[PDB]
A paper describes a structure:
As a control experiment, we also determined the cryo-EM map of yeast TRiC in the presence of ATP-AlFx, a nucleotide analog that has been used to mimic the ATP-hydrolysis transition state and can trigger TRiC ring closure. The map was resolved at the resolution of 3.58 Å (termed TRiC-ATP-AlFx), exhibiting a both-ring tightly closed conformation of TRiC.
Author numbering:
A (entry chain Q): 260 to 414
B (entry chain D): 49 to 96
C (entry chain D): 241 to 432
D (entry chain B): 3 to 520
E (entry chain g): 5 to 75
F (entry chain H): 51 to 151, 158 to 400
G (entry chain E): 24 to 559
C-alpha cells in the first residue's frame, strides 16, 4: 500500500523477474482449480496476468462492482467471501448448476437461475416492455407487492 | 521623456535622435547617420 | 567558496547517527583548508565574480576570513574580470590548487571610502609588470540625468584624442573648414 | 440556390479574368521602375516595430508587401524561387511574366483568342527563344585568363542595378576573387559578411584569412606569430559524461570533496592531452568556463569561446585544418596552420584578424556604409553578385546582356510564327513583343525614348550584327563586347523558363474561389 | 400567425371556477369587520390624495381598484 | 429523410429508430415513440417505422373519443382486449413450414432502403452469414461489417473471416511477406517493445561493471519473448498493446507478420474465425493453440490495406467490405445488411 | 397552437424542413451549380481553378476531387458530390471530373421526369437496369491486348499515359512524362504482370529549377545531409567491391543505458575513474563494428552525439542524423538491406547495396538533400519533379500521381477502352434502342439515361469551341452506319476521328466506375424528401 516499486540490484534478479510473477499467479490459481471451482466472482478490476491462467482451466470470470451487487450474489449460492487469494474452504463454496449467456434485449446477460433442488434466495424478475417509462413504475409496482409480503411477518 | 519611467537630458545629437522615435522612414535614417559618426569618430555627430 | 556541490545531482545518505557529527566537521574543514592556503600567500583582499546556482561565499566561510583580517568583495560582473586582471596585474585564480603568490597582484593602500552615505572602494598605487595600464574616473552629480550627461560629455572628449592619435594632424574649427571649402569650390565650379 | 457558405467570394465570369490580369499589372508596375542601373530603390513600411527596409531586389519587396490576390501570389512565388535557385533576376522574372499577361489580355478581349491557344503559342515560341541563346553562348573556360576576366564583367552588370553602380569597378575585383578562392564551390555560406557602420562606401575590402568578431577570453595576447589553430566542437566544459542517471552517493562530506575534485582532474587530464599537439591556439565553439581557461595560461595556448557552428565550417576551410575531438589519438588528427594572428578593432567592436593562412577555400568580407539601410543593401547586392559568379564556375556559358539577349530571342520567334499560321501567329508574335518590354523599360528609367531607340536596336540585328546592344550612358546603340556587359547563361534560361511557366498559370484560371478567412 | 391575439392560452374547467369563487370571497372577507354596531372603520387612499374613512359597504368597494375581472 | 444535427453530421435514414435518435425530442409524450422504435430495432430489427405509424394512429382514432363522454380507461379496455385476440390471430397466419427447409425473408427486409434493387447479389451473402453461427450462440459481433469510403457497392465480396485496419505503419512491415501459403495465426496479449515491464521502473546499480549487464539483460528479456514465438512457427502475431519497431524488425528477417493497435472487438472475431485461443504470455504458447486457414493475402481497398482471413474449414466469423461514393452510402448498406441478418 | 408552446425537437426555430416539389428543385439546382463548375474544366481544353484556403495557401487545379475537397459548402447535396469525386480518386484515380458531370446529367433528366408525375423510385429503377446494359455493351466491343508481348505492351502504357497527362498544367512536357511514368512500372512489377505494388513508388517534390530537369532516379531521396560535413559529398565505392555496403541503424550512438529510469551511485573516486574509461571504450567499440563489417555510410534514426563526428571522420564513414522512421522503411527497400537493431547483431549480410550516394547543390542556398542511385533494376522508383513555381511543383505531383493510377489499372487483365467521348456515344445508342422494345412506364427512364451519356461528348465540344449539336449528330450517325465504336470527339483538331490512329486509350475499370458512381448516387438523392438542416 506504500511505494510499490520494483527493486533490481543486478542483472541476475532482472532475468528472473519476468518469470517470477508468472509463477505466483500459477501457484495461487492452481489451488483453486484443484478444488473444482469453475467460476470466480471478482469485486474489482482483474489484471491480464491473472486472467490468463483462469482460461487455462476453463474458469469463468465475473465482475461485481460496488458492494450491494456482490452481497446478494452469495445469498443465492450460500457462499462466504474471503479476502485472500488462497484455496477457499470447501464448506464456503456455493452451488450453481448451470450458467448460460443468451441475448434478451440485444446484450449478453448471465443466467444465475437455480433449479428445483438446492433452492436459492433473492430471485430476480425479468421485466420486458416496449417503453422504458412503463418499466420504471412496474418496478415500483412489484415492490409494492414485495412490501405486502413483509406485512405477513411482523403481525 | 522615454516611454518608461526613465528621463534623459542630453545635448548629444545621437542620444537625442536615439531616444526620440520617428514615424518617417527617411527621417529614421538620420538616427543611423549619427551612429555612423559616433562609432567611427565620436565627435561632431550633431553637425552631420 | 562553499560546501562541495557538483553540477551532477548528488545524494548524501547518512547511515549512522554518528556520521552526522563528522559531516558538520568536514563541511567547515573543507572551507577552512581553502582559507588556510590563502593566509600562506598573505592575500588580504579577495575579489569574487557574480555567482550562478549556489552562492559565491557561504556565511560559514565569512567567519574564517574575518578573524584573519581579509577583505572580501563579491558579486563582480564577469565582463569586469578582464579590466581587473590587466589593471591590477593579478592573474585570476580559478582553483585552490593553482593559488600561489606569483599570481597575486600588489597594492599600496586598499581603503573603502564612505562619504555622504555612499561607499566606494579605491586602490592607491599599482606595482607590477604591465604593458597596458588602466585608468578610472569617478563621476558625481545632482541626479542620474546630470551624471549620465556628465559621462556622455566625456565620451565626446575621449574621442577627440582618439582621432588625433589614430590620424595625426588637426585643423581649426569654429567655422573655418565650412567657409574655406565653399570658397575653393566656387572658383572651380565656374571652370567646369 | 447557394451551395457555398456565408462570406465566400467567387467570380465565375468576366470579373475573374479582369481581376487576374489587372492584379498582375500592379505587381509588374511596382517592380518596373527597379529594372536597370538607372532604377530607383523602394521603401517598405513595416506594420510592427516601425522597421524600415530599403531594397532594390524584387524578391524581398513582393514577399514583404502583403498581397491577397492569388494572381499576385503567383508572381511572388516565382520570385522566391528565382532568388533561391540562381540568386539574381527576381525583378526580370516578375516583369517578363507580367508582360506575357499584358499581350495575352488583348488577344482574348480584342483578337478573341482562345486561352489555351495563347498558352500553346508560348510553347513553340519558348523553344525558339531557348535555342537562340544556345548558339549565342560562348564558353571561355578553355582559358583561365579569359574566364577570370569574364567574372569581372558579370559582377559589373549585377552591381549596376544596385546602389553600388558607382563603386562597382572597385567591387568587381572583390567579388571575382572571392569566388576564385572557393575553387569552384557554389556554397555561399562559407563566405562571411561583416557589416560595419560609418566611413566611406568605397572602403570595403577583402582580407585573406578569417575575420572573427569574437575575442580572446582574458589573458591571451592580441597578436601572436606562428600559432597552430585547433577546433573542438564538443563538451570540454563541466563534462556531464553522457547518461543523466548518474549520481554521487556520499556517506560523509569528506568523500564528497574528493568526488568533485575528481571532476577537475578529468578537466586537467583532457587539457594536458591538447598540449601534446604543440599548438599555440585552441578554439571551442562551446563557451569555456573560467577553470578550463586558466589551464591554457601555463601552456601558452590561446582560447576562444562562443563560436557559432556555421562559423566553424567557415573557420575550418580558412585554416585548412581538421575538426578534432577524442584527443587520445594524435596521429589521425590534423591541425590548422596560420602565419600570424592579430586582434584588431573596426569601429567600437574589436575583431580577430587572421593573415597568412594556408588554405584559401573561405574568406570574410567587410563592408562600410553611412546607414544601416545601405549596409543591408550592400550585403544583398553582393549576395546576388556572388550567387551568379558561383554558378558560373559550374556552367561557364555566358550571354551578353543590356537589352541584347532579349532582342536576339525575339529574332527566332518571328521566324517560327510564319510556319505555324492558324490563329497562334497572334500568340507567337505576342511573345516577341513581350520581349521588347525588357530593353524598353531600361530606356524608360533613364528618361529615353521607348520607340525610336528600341527600333534602332531591332534594325541593327536584322542587318547581320548580333553584337549590337543598348547603351544607357550615351543613350545610343553601342557594342556590348567593348563595354563589357555580359551575364550568365543560366540566368538567361531561368528568366525565360520561369516567366513562360508562370504565364501558363493564370491563363488557365477561369474561376477564382475565396474561402472565408480564418 | 398567433391566431387569437387575445389570451391565446385559456384557463377552463374547475380552475376557472375556483378563481371566481376565491376572488368573490376576498371581497366579503375585508368587510366582515364592517358589520355590526361595534364594527371598525376602513381608510382608503385614492390617486388624487383625498382620504375617505367610513364603514359603509358601497363607499369601500367603488374606491378600490380590483384587477380580478370577476371580482 | 435528410437530417442534419447541430454538429453538421449528414445522415439519410428512413428507419423510424434512426430518425428519432438523430433528433432530440424534449416532448414527454413524443419520447414514447422513441422507446418503441429502439425496442423494436433491438430484438427483431425490422418494423420500427410500422410501429410508430401504428402507435400514432391508435392515438388519432382515440382523439374523437376523448372529446366525447368516453372515459380514459374505457378506451384502453378496447385496445388491451383487441390485442389479445390479435396475437392469437397471427399464430393462425403463420405456418410451421418445416418442409422445403432465408432467401425470401432477406429480400423483403431490404425494402424501403438502399440496395433493395441489388437483392440479386447482397442477399446471397446474407444467407451464408447467419449459417456460420451455431445454434444457441448466434453472436452479433461475428457478423460485423467494416465500412470503406469510396468505390462502388457492387464490388463487395464475401469473406470467411474478419478483416481489420492496420491503423499504423511499421518500418519493418514491407520486409514481411504479404502472401502466406499456410499461415499460423497466434493471438497474444503481450506487449513487445523496449519499455518498463510491470507498473514500476527503477534501477539501483552501484558499480559501473554491473551497469553494462543491466542493459544487456533488458535486451535478452525482450528477445526471449521473440524467440519463443519463432520456435512455435507462428506466421501471424496479433496484439492489443502497442508493438515497437524492435519486435517488428525481428519478425521481418524471419518472414513473420506482425500487427498491433487492433481493437478488442476485432480480435474476438479472430479466435472464432481460425479456432485459436488467446495467450497472454509467451511461455505458455503450445502448437495446438495456433489457428490457420487456407491462404493469407493483403489487398488494398480504397487506399486502405486490410488482412484477409478466408479458407478456414469451420469459421463463425463473417465480415464484409462495403464501398460507396458518399459516406452515408457505405453506412446505409451495412444498415440494410445488419437489419437483414436479424430477420434470418 | 391552443396557447401553449409546441416544441417536438430541440432548436425548433433553428432547423428548417423542405418537402414537396420545392425540395426536389433545390437538390437539382445544387448539382447544376457544381456541374457548370466541373464542365468548364473537363477535357484537354479545360481550365484550372484557384482554391484559396482559410490559412492563405492557394491551390490551382482542374481535378474535381481536389477542388471539392478544399471547397467550403453549405447545402448537403453539393457535399455529396464532394465524396463522389473523392470515391473516384481514392480507388481508380482517373475520371474525377467525369463522375460529377454524369451524375448531374442524370439529375437534370430526372427533374423533367418528376414534373411529369413519375415516382422517383421508378426513375431510379430505370437507371439501375440501364447501367448494366451499357456496361455489358461496351464490354463486348473491347478486345484483349494481353496476346501481345512485352515490347508491344509498353506501347499501350504510353498510349493511356499521354491521355491522363492532358487537361492539366504543364502539359507540354507530357511526352517525357509519359515515358517516365511507364518506366517506373517496368522496373517495379510482378513477373506475371499482375497485382503490382503501388506503395513502392514514392512521390517526392522539389521546388526550383525548370520542368526540363525532371528525370527518373531509382533510390532514396532524403532531406538530411551528412553529419559533420568535413567528408566528401559524393561517396564512391572501393575499386573491387560487392557494393557500397550501406548500413541502417535505428539506434543512436550512446553508451548503453536502461530504458527504465536508473540511478548510478558513485561512492568513491575509483568508481568514478572507471566510468571515464568505460565511456570512451564504448564509442571506440561501436565504430570498430562498422569497420569490421565493411560498411561505409551509416544511417541513424535519432542521430548521435558530437563525440562520434571525428571518430567516424577518421574511418571515412559517412553518417546522417535525425532520419524519420517512415524513411527508414524506404531505405531498406531500395538497397535490399536489413535494418540492424544493435551492433551485436550487425553482420555483412544485412548491409544494403546501391550504385552511388551523392548530394546535389540544387539552388543557391535552399537545403541539402541526399540522393541514392541503383546499378540495376530494383523495387524502388522515386519520382523527381522540378518547377519554377510552388504551385507547379505541387500540381505536378498529383498530375503524375493520377498518371500512375491509370498505368496500374492497365495491369489488370483484359480491360481497355478508347477515350475522346467514343465510349459514352457507343453506350448511349444501346440504351435508347432498348427503350423502344420495353415501352411501358420505364420507356422514359432509358431516354433520360441515354441523353445523360451524350452530355460528356457535348461538354468536350464546348471547351473546344465546337457545335455540340453537329458533333453529336455525326457520332450517332456513324455508329448506325458502321459498327466501329472508335469514332469520338477530337478536342486537339488533328483530324482522324478514329481513336486507333490517335492512340488515345483509357482503362475500362475507370469508365465502368463513372457509370456506377453516378447512377448509384442519384438513386439515393432522388429518395430524399424531408430535409432537416440545423443552424450553424
Amino acid at each position: 500500500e506504500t511505494k510499490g516499486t520494483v527493486l533490481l540490484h543486478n542483472a541476475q534478479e532482472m532475468l528472473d523477474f519476468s518469470k517470477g510473477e508468472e509463477k505466483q499467479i500459477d501457484a495461487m490459481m492452481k489451488e483453486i482449480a484443484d478444488m473444482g471451482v469453475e467460476c470466480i466472482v471478482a469485486g474489482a478490476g482483474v489484471g491480464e496476468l491473472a486472467l490468463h491462467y483462469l482460461n487455462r482451466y476453463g474458469i469463468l470470470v465475473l465482475k461485481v462492482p460496488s458492494k450491494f451487487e456482490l452481497r446478494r450474489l452469495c445469498r443465492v449460492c450460500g457462499a462466504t467471501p474471503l479476502p485472500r487469494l488462497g484455496a477457499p474452504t470447501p464448506e464456503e463454496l456455493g452451488l450453481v448448476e448451470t450458467v448460460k449467456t443468451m441475448e434478451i434485449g440485444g446484450d449478453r446477460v448471465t443466467v444465475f437461475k437455480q433449479e428445483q433442488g438446492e433452492i436459492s434466495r433473492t430471485s430476480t424478475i425479468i421485466l420486458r416492455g416496449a417503453t422504458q417509462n412503463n418499466l420504471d413504475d412496474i418496478e415500483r409496482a412489484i415492490d409494492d407487492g414485495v412490501a405486502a409480503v413483509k406485512g405477513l411477518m411482523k403481525p | 521623456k522615454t516611454s518608461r519611467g526613465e528621463i534623459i537630458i542630453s545635448n548629444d545629437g545621437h542620444t537625442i535622435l536615439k531616444q526620440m522615435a520617428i514615424l518617417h522612414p527617411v527621417a529614421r535614417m538620420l538616427v543611423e547617420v549619427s551612429a555612423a559618426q559616433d562609432s567611427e569618430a565620436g565627435d561632431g555627430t550633431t553637425s552631420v | 567558496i562553499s560546501p562541495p556541490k557538483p553540477d551532477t545531482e548528488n545524494n548524501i545518505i547518512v547511515n549512522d547517527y554518528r556520521q552526522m557529527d563528522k559531516i558538520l566537521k568536514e563541511e567547515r574543514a573543507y572551507l577552512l583548508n581553502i582559507c588556510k592556503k590563502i593566509k600562506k600567500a598573505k592575500c588580504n583582499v579577495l575579489l569574487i565574480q557574480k555567482s550562478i546556482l549556489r552562492d559565491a561565499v557561504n556565511d560559514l566561510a565569512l567567519h574564517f576570513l574575518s578573524k584573519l583580517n581579509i577583505m572580501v568583495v563579491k558579486d563582480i560582473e564577469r565582463e569586469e574580470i578582464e579590466f581587473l586582471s590587466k589593471g591590477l596585474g593579478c592573474k585570476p585564480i580559478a582553483d585552490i590548487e593553482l593559488f600561489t603568490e606569483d599570481r597575486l597582484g600588489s597594492a599600496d593602500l586598499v581603503e573603502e571610502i564612505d562619504s555622504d552615505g555612499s561607499k566606494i572602494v579605491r586602490v592607491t598605487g599599482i606595482r607590477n609588470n604591465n604593458a597596458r595600464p588602466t585608468v578610472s574616473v569617478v563621476i558625481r552629480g545632482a541626479n542620474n540625468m546630470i551624471i549620465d550627461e556628465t559621462e556622455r560629455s566625456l565620451h565626446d572628449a575621449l574621442c577627440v584624442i582618439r582621432c588625433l592619435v589614430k590620424e595625426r594632424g588637426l585643423i581649426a574649427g569654429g567655422g573655418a573648414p565650412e567657409i574655406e571649402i565653399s570658397r575653393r569650390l566656387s572658383k572651380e565650379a565656374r571652370s567646369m | 440556390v447557394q451551395i457555398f457558405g456565408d462570406q465566400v467570394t467567387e467570380e465565375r465570369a468576366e470579373n475573374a479574368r479582369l481581376s487576374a490580369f489587372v492584379g498582375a499589372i500592379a505587381v509588374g508596375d511596382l517592380v518596373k521602375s527597379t529594372l536597370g542601373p538607372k532604377g530607383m530603390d523602394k521603401l517598405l513600411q513595416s506594420a510592427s516595430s516601425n522597421t524600415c527596409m530599403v531594397t532594390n531586389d524584387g524578391a524581398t519587396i513582393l514577399k514583404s508587401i502583403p498581397l491577397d490576390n492569388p494572381a499576385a501570389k503567383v508572381l511572388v512565388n516565382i520570385s522566391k524561387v528565382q532568388d533561391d535557385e540562381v540568386g539574381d533576376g527576381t525583378t526580370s522574372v516578375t516583369v517578363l511574366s507580367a508582360e506575357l499577361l499584358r499581350e495575352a489580355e488583348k488577344l482574348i478581349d480584342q483578337s478573341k483568342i482562345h486561352p489555351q491557344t495563347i498558352i500553346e503559342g508560348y510553347r513553340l515560341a519558348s523553344a525558339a527563344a531557348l535555342d537562340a541563346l544556345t548558339k549565342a553562348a560562348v564558353d571561355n573556360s578553355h582559358d583561365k585568363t579569359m574566364f577570370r576576366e569574364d567574372l569581372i564583367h558579370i559582377a559589373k552588370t549585377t552591381l549596376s542595378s544596385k546602389i553600388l553602380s558607382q563603386d562597382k569597378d572597385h567591387f568587381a575585383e572583390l567579388a571575382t576573387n572571392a569566388i576564385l578562392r572557393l575553387k569552384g564551390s557554389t556554397n555561399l555560406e562559407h563566405i562571411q559578411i561583416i557589416k560595419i557602420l560609418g566611413g566611406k562606401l568605397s572602403d570595403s575590402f577583402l582580407d585573406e584569412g578569417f575575420i572573427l568578431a569574437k575575442k580572446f577570453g582574458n589573458n591571451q595576447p592580441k597578436r601572436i606569430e606562428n600559432a597552430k589553430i585547433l577546433i573542438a566542437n564538443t563538451t570540454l566544459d563541466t563534462d556531464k559524461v553522457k547518461i543523466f542517471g548518474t549520481k554521487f552517493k556520499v556517506d560523509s562530506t569528506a568523500k564528497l570533496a574528493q568526488l568533485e575534485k575528481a571532476e577537475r582532474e578529468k578537466m586537467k587530464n583532457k587539457i594536458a592531452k591538447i598540449s601534446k599537439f604543440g599548438i599555440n591556439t585552441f578554439i571551442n565553439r562551446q563557451l569555456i568556463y573560467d577553470y578550463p581557461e586558466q589551464l591554457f595560461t601555463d601552456l601558452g595556448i590561446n582560447s576562444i569561446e562562443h563560436a557559432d557552428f556555421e562559423g566553424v565550417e567557415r573557420l575550418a576551410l580558412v585554416t585548412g585544418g581538421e575538426v578534432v575531438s577524442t584527443f587520445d589519438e594524435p596521429s589521425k588528427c590534423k591541425l590548422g596552420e596560420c602565419d600570424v594572428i592579430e586582434e584588431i578593432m573596426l569601429g567600437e567592436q574589436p575583431f580577430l584578424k587572421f593573415s597568412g593562412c594556408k588554405a584559401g577555400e573561405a574568406c570574410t568580407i567587410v563592408l562600410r556604409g553611412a546607414t544601416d539601410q545601405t549596409l543591408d543593401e550592400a550585403e544583398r547586392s553582393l549576395h546576388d553578385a556572388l550567387s551568379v559568379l558561383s554558378q558560373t564556375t559550374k556552367e561557364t556559358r555566358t550571354v551578353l546582356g543590356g537589352g541584347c539577349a532579349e532582342m536576339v530571342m525575339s529574332k527566332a520567334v518571328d521566324t517560327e510564327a510564319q510556319n505555324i499560321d492558324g490563329k497562334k501567329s497572334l500568340a507567337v508574335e505576342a511573345f516577341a513583343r513581350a520581349l521588347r518590354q525588357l530593353p524598353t523599360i531600361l530606356a524608360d528609367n533613364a528618361g529615353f525614348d521607348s520607340s525610336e531607340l528600341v527600333s534602332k536596336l531591332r534594325s541593327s540585328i536584322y542587318n547581320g550584327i548580333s553584337t549590337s546592344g543598348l547603351d544607357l550612358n550615351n543613350g545610343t546603340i553601342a557594342d556590348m563586347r567593348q563595354l563589357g556587359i555580359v551575364e550568365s547563361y543560366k540566368l538567361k534560361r531561368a528568366v525565360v523558363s520561369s516567366a513562360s511557366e508562370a504565364a501558363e498559370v493564370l491563363l488557365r484560371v477561369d474561376n477564382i474561389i475565396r474561402a472565408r478567412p480564418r | 400567425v398567433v391566431f387569437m391575439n387575445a389570451s391565446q392560452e385559456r384557463t377552463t374547467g374547475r380552475q376557472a371556477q375556483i378563481s371566481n369563487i376565491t376572488a368573490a370571497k376576498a371581497v366579503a372577507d375585508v368587510i366582515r369587520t364592517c358589520l355590526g354596531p361595534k364594527a371598525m372603520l376602513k381608510m382608503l387612499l385614492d390617486p388624487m390624495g383625498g382620504l375617505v374613512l367610513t364603514n359603509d359597504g358601497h363607499a369601500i368597494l367603488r374606491e378600490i381598484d380590483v384587477a380580478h375581472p370577476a371580482a | 429523410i435528410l437530417i442534419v444535427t447541430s454538429n453538421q453530421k449528414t445522415t439519410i435514414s428512413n428507419d423510424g429508430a434512426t430518425i428519432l435518435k438523430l433528433l432530440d425530442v424534449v416532448h414527454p409524450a413524443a419520447k414514447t415513440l422513441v422507446d418503441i422504435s429502439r425496442a423494436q430495432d433491438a430484438e427483431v430489427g425490422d418494423g420500427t417505422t410500422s410501429v410508430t405509424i401504428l402507435a400514432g394512429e391508435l392515438m388519432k382514432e382515440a382523439k374523437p373519443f376523448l372529446e366525447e363522454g368516453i372515459s380514459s380507461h374505457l378506451i384502453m379496455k378496447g385496445y388491451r382486449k383487441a390485442v389479445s385476440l390479435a396475437v392469437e390471430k397471427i399464430n393462425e397466419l403463420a405456418v410451421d413450414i418445416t418442409s422445403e427447409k432465408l432467401e425470401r425473408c432477406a429480400r423483403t427486409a431490404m425494402s424501403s432502403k438502399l440496395i433493395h434493387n441489388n437483392a440479386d447479389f447482397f442477399v446471397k451473402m446474407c444467407v451464408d452469414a447467419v449459417l456460420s453461427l451455431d445454434r444457441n450462440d448466434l453472436d452479433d459481433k461475428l457478423i460485423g461489417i467494416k465500412k470503406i469510403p469510396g468505390g462502388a457497392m457492387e464490388e463487395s465480396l464475401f469473406i470467411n473471416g474478419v478483416a481489420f485496419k492496420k491503423t499504423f505503419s511499421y518500418a519493418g512491415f514491407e520486409q514481411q511477406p504479404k502472401k502466406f501459403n499456410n499461415p499460423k495465426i497466434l493471438s497474444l496479449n503481450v506487449e513487445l517493445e523496449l519499455k518498463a515491464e510491470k507498473d514500476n521502473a527503477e534501477v539501483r546499480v552501484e558499480h559501473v561493471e554491473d551497469y553494462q549487464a543491466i542493459v544487456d539483460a533488458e535486451w535478452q528479456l525482450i528477445f526471449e519473448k521473440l524467440r519463443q514465438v519463432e520456435e512455435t512457427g507462428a506466421n501471424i502475431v496479433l496484439s492489443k498493446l502497442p508493438i515497437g519497431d524492435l519486435a517488428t524488425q525481428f519478425f521481418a528477417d524471419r518472414n513473420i507478420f506482425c500487427a498491433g493497435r487492433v481493437s478488442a472487438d476485432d480480435m474476438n472475431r479472430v479466435i472464432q474465425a481460425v479456432g485459436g485461443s488467446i495467450q497472454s504470455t509467451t511461455s505458455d504458447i503450445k502448437p495446438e493453440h495456433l489457428g490457420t486457414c487456407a491462404l493469407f493475402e493483403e489487398m488494398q481497398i480504397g487506399s486502405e490495406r486490410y488482412n484477409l482471413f478466408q479458407g478456414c474449414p469451420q469459421a463463425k466469423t463473417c465480415t464484409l467490405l462495403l464501398r460507396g461514393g458518399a459516406e452515408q452510402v457505405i453506412a446505409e448498406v451495412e444498415r440494410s445488411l445488419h437489419d437483414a441478418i436479424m430477420i434470418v | 397552437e391552443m396557447g401553449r408552446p409546441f416544441i417536438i425537437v430541440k432548436d425548433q426555430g433553428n432547423k428548417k424542413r423542405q418537402h414537396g416539389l420545392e425540395a426536389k428543385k433545390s437538390h437539382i439546382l445544387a448539382a447544376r451549380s457544381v456541374a457548370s463548375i466541373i464542365k468548364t474544366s473537363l477535357g484537354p481544353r479545360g481550365l484550372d481553378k484557384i482554391l484559396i484556403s482559410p490559412d492563405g495557401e492557394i491551390t490551382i487545379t482542374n481535378d474535381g476531387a481536389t477542388i471539392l475537397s478544399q471547397m467550403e459548402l453549405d447545402n448537403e447535396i453539393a457535399k455529396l458530390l464532394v465524396q463522389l469525386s473523392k470515391s473516384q480518386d481514392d480507388e481508380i484515380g482517373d475520371g474525377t471530373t467525369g463522375v460529377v458531370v454524369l451524375a448531374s446529367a442524370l439529375l437534370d433528366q430526372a427533374l423533367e421526369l418528376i414534373q411529369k408525375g413519375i415516382h422517383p423510385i421508378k426513375i431510379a429503377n430505370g437507371f439501375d437496369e440501364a447501367a448494366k446494359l451499357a456496361i455489358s455493351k461496351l464490354e463486348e466491343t473491347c478486345d484483349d491486348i494481353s496476346a501481345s508481348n512485352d515490347e508491344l505492351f509498353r506501347d499501350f502504357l504510353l498510349r493511356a499515359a499521354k491521355t491522363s497527362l492532358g487537361s492539366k498544367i504543364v502539359s507540354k512536357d507530357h511526352d517525357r512524362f509519359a515515358e517516365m511514368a511507364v518506366e517506373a512500372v517496368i522496373n517495379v512489377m510482378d513477373k506475371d504482370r499482375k497485382d503490382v505494388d503501388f506503395d513502392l513508388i514514392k512521390m517526392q517534390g522539389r521546388v526550383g529549377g525548370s520542368i526540363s530537369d525532371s528525370k527518373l532516379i531509382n533510390g532514396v531521396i532524403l532531406d538530411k545531409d551528412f553529419s559533420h560535413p568535413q567528408m566528401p559529398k559524393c561517396v564512391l565505392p572501393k575499386e573491387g567491391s560487392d557494393g557500397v555496403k550501406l548500413a541502417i541503424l535505428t539506434c543512436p550512438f550512446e553508451p548503453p543505458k536502461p530504458k527504465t529510469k536508473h540511478k548510478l551511485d558513485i561512492s568513491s573516486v575509483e568508481e568514478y575513474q572507471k566510468l571515464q574509461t568505460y565511456e570512451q571504450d564504448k564509442f571506440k567499440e561501436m565504430i570498430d563494428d562498422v569497420k569490421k563489417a565493411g560498411a561505409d555510410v551509416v544511417i541513424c534514426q535519432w542521430g548521435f552525439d558530437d563525440e562520434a563526428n571525428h571518430l567516424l571522420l577518421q574511418n571515412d564513414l559517412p553518417a546522417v542524423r535525425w532520419v524519420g522512421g517512415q524513411e527508414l522503411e524506404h531505405i531498406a527497400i531500395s538497397t535490399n538491406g536489413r535494418i540492424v537493431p544493435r551492433f551485436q547483431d550487425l553482420s555483412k549480410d544485412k548491409l544494403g547495396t546501391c550504385s552511388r550516394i551523392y548530394e546535389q547543390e540544387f539552388g543557391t542556398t535552399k537545403d541539402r538533400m541526399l540522393i541514392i542511385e541503383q546499378s540495376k533494376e530494383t523495387k524502388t522508383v522515386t519520382c523527381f519533379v522540378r518547377g519554377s513555381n510552388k504551385m507547379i511543383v505541387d500540381e505536378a505531383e498529383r498530375a503524375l500521381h493520377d498518371s500512375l493510377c491509370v498505368v496500374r489499372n492497365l495491369v489488370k487483365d483484359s480491360r481497355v477502352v478508347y477515350g475522346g467521348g467514343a465510349a459514352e456515344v457507343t453506350m448511349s445508342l444501346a440504351v435508347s434502342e432498348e427503350a423502344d422494345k420495353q415501352r411501358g412506364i420505364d420507356q422514359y427512364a432509358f431516354r433520360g439515361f441515354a441523353q445523360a451519356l451524350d452530355t460528356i461528348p457535348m461538354t468536350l465540344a464546348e471547351n473546344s469551341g465546337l457545335d455540340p449539336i453537329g458533333t453529336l449528330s455525326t457520332l450517332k450517325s456513324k455508329q448506325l452506319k458502321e459498327k466501329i465504336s472508335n469514332i469520338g470527339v477530337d478536342c486537339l483538331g488533328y483530324g482522324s476521328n478514329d481513336m486507333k490512329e490517335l492512340f488515345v486509350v483509357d482503362p475500362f475499370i475507370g469508365k465502368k466506375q463513372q457509370i456506377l458512381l453516378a447512377t448509384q448516387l442519384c438513386r439515393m438523392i432522388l429518395k430524399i424528401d424531408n430535409v432537416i438542416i440545423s443552424g450553424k
